[PDB]
Amino acid sequence: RVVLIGVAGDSGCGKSTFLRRLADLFGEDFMTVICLDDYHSLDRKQRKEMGITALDPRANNFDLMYEQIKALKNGESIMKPIYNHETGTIDPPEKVDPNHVIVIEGLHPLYDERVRSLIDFSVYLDISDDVKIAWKIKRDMAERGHSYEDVIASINARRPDFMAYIDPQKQYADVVLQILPSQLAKEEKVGNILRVRMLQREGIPGFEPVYLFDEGSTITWIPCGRKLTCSYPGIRLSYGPDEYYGHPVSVLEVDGRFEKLDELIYIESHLSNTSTKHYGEVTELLLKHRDYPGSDNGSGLFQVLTGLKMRATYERLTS
Amino acid sequence: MSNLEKQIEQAREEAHKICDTEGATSGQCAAAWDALEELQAEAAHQRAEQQDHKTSFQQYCDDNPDAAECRIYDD
Amino acid sequence: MVRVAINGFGRIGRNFMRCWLQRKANSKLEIVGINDTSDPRTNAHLLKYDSMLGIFQDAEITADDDCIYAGGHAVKCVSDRNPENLPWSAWGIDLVIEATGVFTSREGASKHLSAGAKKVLITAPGKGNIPTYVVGVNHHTYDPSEDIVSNASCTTNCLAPIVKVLHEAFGIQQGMMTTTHSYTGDQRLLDASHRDLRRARAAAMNIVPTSTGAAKAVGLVIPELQGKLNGIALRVPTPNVSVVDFVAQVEKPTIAEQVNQVIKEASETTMKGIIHYSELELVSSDYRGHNASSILDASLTMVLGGNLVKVVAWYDNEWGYSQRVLDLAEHMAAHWA
Amino acid sequence: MVRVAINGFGRIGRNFMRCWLQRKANSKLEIVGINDTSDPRTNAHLLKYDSMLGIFQDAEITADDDCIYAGGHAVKCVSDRNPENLPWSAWGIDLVIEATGVFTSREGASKHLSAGAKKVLITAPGKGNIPTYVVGVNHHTYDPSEDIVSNASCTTNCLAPIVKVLHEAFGIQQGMMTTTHSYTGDQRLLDASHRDLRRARAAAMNIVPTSTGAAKAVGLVIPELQGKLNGIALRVPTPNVSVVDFVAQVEKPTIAEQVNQVIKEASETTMKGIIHYSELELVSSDYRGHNASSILDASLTMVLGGNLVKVVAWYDNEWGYSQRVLDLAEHMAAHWA
Amino acid sequence: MVRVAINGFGRIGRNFMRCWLQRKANSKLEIVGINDTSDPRTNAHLLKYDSMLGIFQDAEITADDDCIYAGGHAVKCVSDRNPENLPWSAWGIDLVIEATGVFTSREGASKHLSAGAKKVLITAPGKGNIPTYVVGVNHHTYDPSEDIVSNASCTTNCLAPIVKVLHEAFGIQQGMMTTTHSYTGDQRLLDASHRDLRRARAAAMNIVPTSTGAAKAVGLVIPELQGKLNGIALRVPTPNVSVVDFVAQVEKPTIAEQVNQVIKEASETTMKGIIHYSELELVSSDYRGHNASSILDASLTMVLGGNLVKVVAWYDNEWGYSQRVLDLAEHMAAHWA
Ligand SMILES: NC(=O)c1ccc[n+]([C@@H]2O[C@H](COP(=O)([O-])OP(=O)(O)OC[C@H]3O[C@@H](n4cnc5c(N)ncnc54)[C@H](O)[C@@H]3O)[C@@H](O)[C@H]2O)c1
Ligand SMILES: NC(=O)c1ccc[n+]([C@@H]2O[C@H](COP(=O)([O-])OP(=O)(O)OC[C@H]3O[C@@H](n4cnc5c(N)ncnc54)[C@H](O)[C@@H]3O)[C@@H](O)[C@H]2O)c1
């Protein structure tokens, strides 16, 4: 069989740690990675000539990617082209073979509707603009390129078509992870502690939600107290039924910074329908890689929760 | 890096020029800043791979694995 | 008759050659090529005078710089570290026996397939989804178009028949193991620089522990137990033979005598030639050169609470593992496609 | 100040003497009598030049045929195999330290009590209902009228604090152990005649297995786990230090990191000086002379299925066991009755 | 103060570093550079936890990927097998200590001189006419423009002071030696492929003999005995220390007591700190870490026919040889030109 997983976000294709957590979960033996900048129509020269970004529905051969994607189901080794990233040009293609798990990730994994009918499980990954700025400050600060504070003006110039081109895809994804500045902590820089939330969608079977103590009644839980000595500022979870874009969703939400072990196992003991064959398996998957960015906050929690639901969908698809 | 090291500053000069001259809010200089951000993204991809520069073992065991320094009979 | 080859004339290669010299008449295999990083003068001496199995006695060993005459039988020999420059199609090689401990990947081992060999049997737990097969458990269920097959480690090759018997008779929920392993060639003799720190220390002096995934390879060769078997290894200063402890958590309750009875009759019906059963109070060095891939030690089997069993198994990781390699090679010769 | 004596100046006796020479100032114990089957000229040499702990350095060792001068401090010394002909009341002996491995019975050890000694601390798992006490578990709960007390074996003395911590934190249903043990003096060097057959074989050559009841002694020192703990031992050719594997079946489920956290904080609150916690990739010989009675090896702790835990513990059965003997002796000196 | 470097951080390098950490205050030498084929994280661990000399205790050892902090003292560290790409003039290196066992030729060792180092002291008997110097025999007679100097082997470094004393006191016609040598890192652990066949066999199992010319190196460091001294070596399974037998044919006749008297007074007048004299019945492991480069064993010295003498000398080929290397390095620092 062929299963398929759609990831959506502008974190750079193969440049986000969610794929790394999926690699720790499945293994690169069982899955292969497909970037989606490879199906660009023409180059950055023709982007400058046509005056167009890399976000245009003109800018990709959306039909040949569909033909290779449908041929992925039939077992044959696909021949996919490669965007030469340094030059902006296009490599003559590479013949790669299908695997047990196939992923699809790029700026438009979901813009096509026939592949939206093809993708077995979908993830959009949203980022608020504040932590965009806080990540670009780290981007041009660690490199010391000295290109800051007009990239601020690049943000809002990149903004308007992006909301037209990309953001209506989240109206069709299953799970969407938003990352916000933390309301809890104020006297830091604006990107230390994240306020993350995984708006997951009901409906489509196999995918359960992961509900905190009750399906469908908003519950804001702080695990500090008689059995956990919370540091500053500690965790503040949330939950809530909601209808996002007129669709039955269930936001599960975490604010805070995981400082130690027991506060991360105590949270995991109380989530429900998390689909583990193993007690504390989510905590083990958190602490197999202490060095990954975002393990100390809820981003690494939610990414591995989504990947664990991907295990659930894979077990549903392969019996 | 020297080539993209120059090209990022060249596209930065163009970002100062084309989006002050030929329209600050249109598709042309949005394509220009999109290009410069992709150049920055490939600088990031170069940066992370040079952070993952191995010192010796994934070189000397890359080319000659069976030396006594990195035989692993994972048995 | 199948023309076979040996990549890496080390411990496993010398034992493979010695086994084929002791099982010559019943063989569809003719060993025609070896390659080591040594000249052909040295490794013939190392074949004849093994400091573990004594002096070889049955056939005469001699060599010159291009061939090796073992008992009148000639065998070719070459030396190269690149697998791509090797005369395989020039020698007519169906099956090459990867035993260098280097080419564990599919892309590494497939270099011989590219260079002109038809099938490769690698004597290591390979990285990536290489089809693994253990004689006595699932040596039947290989597809003969699978040209790149892998025998597992010696610990897995010992442990998996016992786990098969106990899973069929009782059913296994979970299971640990802790093999007290003889020291292998990877460890440095004195404290020298090494990629892993616990193998960097002295071998003759120390119980060095190591983490292995070779317990999980039972979950490959038995599919319904994957993710349920894990264990560590202890390397102690004995040169040849080793013992494996195995703690399983069965669910059908029983006593210590009954599991011994089950394995004793399984030694005589199905696992004959794989599992030997010994009710003697032997020690380690009485298993140098034993033909079975697991000798169950009877007096130490114990059950606590009905649902928690411990067995221990002697096994020779240099001779019995070579025997299982040669049996798998003959069994793939008997179903050549 | 308590005048103490040593029966049998073997490995445990020499290590006890060396420990008291290194812990002299804080001691309510003064060692005034020893007896070995050797003359006083030889065992002073064996005290000074230990081929395991090197040459002793701090104090001067000399002897003549009636006394031994250790650092200016005189100690008496005699030689007799009959415990009934021994000058105990002539020397004023409160506590004698039985370390011959001979007098394990109550009736054997009570011969010193009859011959004029007040209390006896035997460094062996004694036959019969002798009250056993481990420092760090139940060294408080001895009645001071119990004059015949027993420290358990070194394996039990290592294993029982870990089992105490895991039983308090998680609760234990069942538990196995398999200690990879250094070779002791009881084994014959070459293959010589011996009462047990698996100890009759060569020590430097072999992994010899043996059955021990020293796992059950945890069920003595922890009463609610008796009949639930059992295990075997493996003697491998390392001279000094050893490691113990321990498989428990807990009932409160957890992961591998949490048990390491529990034992790490128990190393710093209650078991301080008993259990050391090491997150290094050390090997065996880096624990020669460590003061703790169990070094938990952190990187090898594993949990399968939530309710099945495995730890391994390095421990020195010649130095740390002597340290616990001397700590128990001082702790019975502090509550002399 | 002389900035010095270490090529090859093996046994001799780790012992050299440990000796300099124990002789820091009286040193004109500051160790500023090392290079091994390992990363700087591993060899700091191997420096701190030596499985032969125990855990280092006096100073703290830590590292990151570019430097090593030994007791607060920083030292640089790099990794390259080509000696020509090494930052010597970038680091200001007067003396580099060749200890890889690779660069024994003049043209090999002179690569460091070309690459920007001022003097090289190689810890091996070098091929070709490299000026060799032994501390205690002819450490005075070096010309300070000789930038490429060689210390001899450990066997020669032990044997030559005894031969100097016996040649001055009695006069030597001929002389044999047979050193019972501890196993070194060159031998393969199991029977693996090796350039010389007698080193190809197992080290922990075997007395392997080998032919050495290190007896003839005494004829280099003592010129009037060249071509008169020859001997073999026996590698036995002891890890650290070794003993050398020495049969000389003197011409001035004497008895066994008189040669002991001569060497005893030479231990107290001229060879002080080189030759220790021991009238104890010690054994091998009581010389792990001894500072002298030869401990003469007194009870075994014998003379047959007046003109035929045999001595035996304990010596540590990993610690005392490092001590003589560091003494030669300081002695060339004291006469820097
Ligand atoms: N040692 C055991 O008892 C045992 C048991 C089961 C499995 N194995 C596996 O068997 C393999 C080999 O074991 P071994 O003890 O024979 O190893 P070894 O290192 O003792 O011998 C391997 C031989 O192959 C040679 N070699 C290495 N790389 C080579 C190359 N690229 N080209 C040519 N020759 C090369 C080596 O120089 C040596 O001659 C390893 O995968 C090991 O894990 C070993
Ligand atoms: N060996 C260890 O590391 C270790 C660890 C824990 C406990 N123990 C226990 O310690 C005891 C002794 O161990 P050991 O290694 O010192 O033993 P050992 O045999 O090495 O030394 C015992 C000494 O006592 C002497 N002796 C024996 N019987 C005697 C008698 N009747 N009268 C006088 N002297 C007598 C022996 O000759 C020898 O000198 C045994 O019970 C052993 O199980 C040993």
Ligand SMILES: NC(=O)c1ccc[n+]([C@@H]2O[C@H](COP(=O)([O-])OP(=O)(O)OC[C@H]3O[C@@H](n4cnc5c(N)ncnc54)[C@H](O)[C@@H]3O)[C@@H](O)[C@H]2O)c1
């Ligand atoms: N082993 C002894 O006790 C002893 C005694 C006297 C003299 N020696 C001589 O000392 C030398 C080294 O002895 P050892 O036991 O330390 O050897 P070793 O092999 O144990 O250690 C040598 C170290 O140097 C490294 N090395 C080798 N070639 C290198 C290169 N080209 N560049 C960088 N690093 C390199 C090795 O990988 C290892 O880290 C040999 O000449 C030996 O004969 C040894």
